[PDB]
Amino acid sequence: MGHHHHHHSHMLPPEQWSHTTVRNALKDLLKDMNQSSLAKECPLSQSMISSIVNSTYYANVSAAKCQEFGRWYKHFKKTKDMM
């Protein structure tokens, strides 16, 4: 807050799905789509997703489920550029 900073990076094209990038995306899907209903169409593990959103002492998260999420992102939205 305070000084209104803007990111020059782009969350629309899969540039790199780091813990921050993925976490900031999930929190918008989850707030309107229930945990189970989300993990249903998503190829990720339900309790893992739940642990990431509420990661207090968790922290230690795998990178694979993030890169594959960026791959799923393409098949989910179909934002042009396909294989």
Curated annotation (Swiss-Prot):
Parent sequence residues shown: 179 to 250 of 763
Q: Which disease is it linked to?
A: Den Hoed-de Boer-Voisin syndrome: A disorder characterized by global developmental delay, moderately to severely impaired intellectual development, poor or absent speech, delayed motor skills, and early-onset epilepsy in many patients. Most affected individuals have feeding difficulties, poor overall growth, dysmorphic facial features, and significant dental anomalies resembling amelogenesis imperfecta. More variable features include visual defects, behavioral abnormalities, and non-specific involvement of other organ systems.
Phosphoserine: residues bearing it: 18
**Family of the protein in this entry:** Belongs to the CUT homeobox family.
The organism named in the record is Homo sapiens
Q: Where in this chain does the record put each CUTL domain?
A: 12-81
Self-association and partners: Interacts with CUX1 (via DNA-binding domains); the interaction inhibits the attachment of both proteins to DNA. Homodimer. Part of the nuclear protein complex gamma-globin promoter and enhancer binding factor (gamma-PE) composed at least of SATB1 and HOXB2. Interaction with CtBP1 when not acetylated stabilizes attachment to DNA and promotes transcription repression. Interacts with PCAF. Interacts with sumoylated PML and HDAC1 via the CMP domain. Interacts also with DYNLT3 and POLR2J2. Binds to EP300.
What does the UniProt record report as the effect of altering residue 14 to L in this chain?
Answer: In DHDBV; uncertain significance
Q: What is this protein called?
A: DNA-binding protein SATB1
Q: Where does the record say this protein resides? A: Nucleus matrix; Nucleus, PML body
